[PDB]
């Protein structure tokens, strides 16, 4: 599913990403545009041969199971396949697990480098919330 961004706003918001760690949701819709443009569908090999899966791109190297990525660890006890569902949930929960892991959103690049310190509530901007 392509979501809008204030559908997308909605969903994050419903299932309490909202300030989640301190992070305005304006943080988590600028992460999923630039991580997944807004498609949970997106997949995208890492060069350690990782693949990070859905609208937050989240790596099979630490956080989801895909059975090819040698090594690897399974901290939010999915299906990496389960981070591409129409329904964000299984997305969110496990956003939550990383962004508590101890670097906050710093886990997404793609934040650190576009996100981090902009005006990220222009996100929401219009939004029904
Ligand atoms: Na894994």
Same mark, same amino acid.
């Given at each position: 599913?392509?979501?809008?961004?204030?559908?997308?706003?909605?969903?994050?918001?419903?299932?309490?990403?909202?300030?989640?760690?301190?992070?305005? %949701?304006? !943080?988590?819709? *600028?992460? /999923?545009?630039?991580? $997944?443009?807004?498609?949970?569908?997106?997949?995208?090999?890492?060069?350690?041969?990782?693949?990070?899966?859905?609208?937050?791109?989240?790596?099979?190297?630490?956080?989801?199971?895909?059975?090819?990525?040698?090594?690897?660890?399974? %901290?939010? !006890?999915?299906? *990496?396949? /389960?981070?591409?569902? $129409?329904?964000?949930?299984?997305?969110?929960?496990?956003?939550?697990?990383?962004?508590?892991?101890?670097?906050?959103?710093?886990?997404?690049?793609?934040?650190?480098?576009?996100?981090?310190?902009?005006?990220?509530?222009?996100?929401?901007?219009?939004?029904?919330?």
């Amino acid at each position: 599913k392509v979501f809008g961004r204030c559908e997308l706003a909605a969903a994050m918001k419903r299932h309490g990403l909202d300030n989640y760690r301190g992070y305005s %949701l304006g !943080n988590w819709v *600028c992460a /999923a545009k630039f991580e $997944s443009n807004f498609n949970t569908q997106a997949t995208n090999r890492n060069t350690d041969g990782s693949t990070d899966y859905g609208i937050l791109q989240i790596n099979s190297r630490w956080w989801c199971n895909d059975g090819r990525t040698p090594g690897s660890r399974n %901290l939010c !006890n999915i299906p *990496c396949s /389960a981070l591409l569902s $129409s329904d964000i949930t299984a997305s969110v929960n496990c956003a939550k697990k990383i962004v508590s892991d101890g670097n906050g959103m710093n886990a997404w690049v793609a934040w650190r480098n576009r996100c981090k310190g902009t005006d990220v509530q222009a996100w929401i901007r219009g939004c029904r919330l």
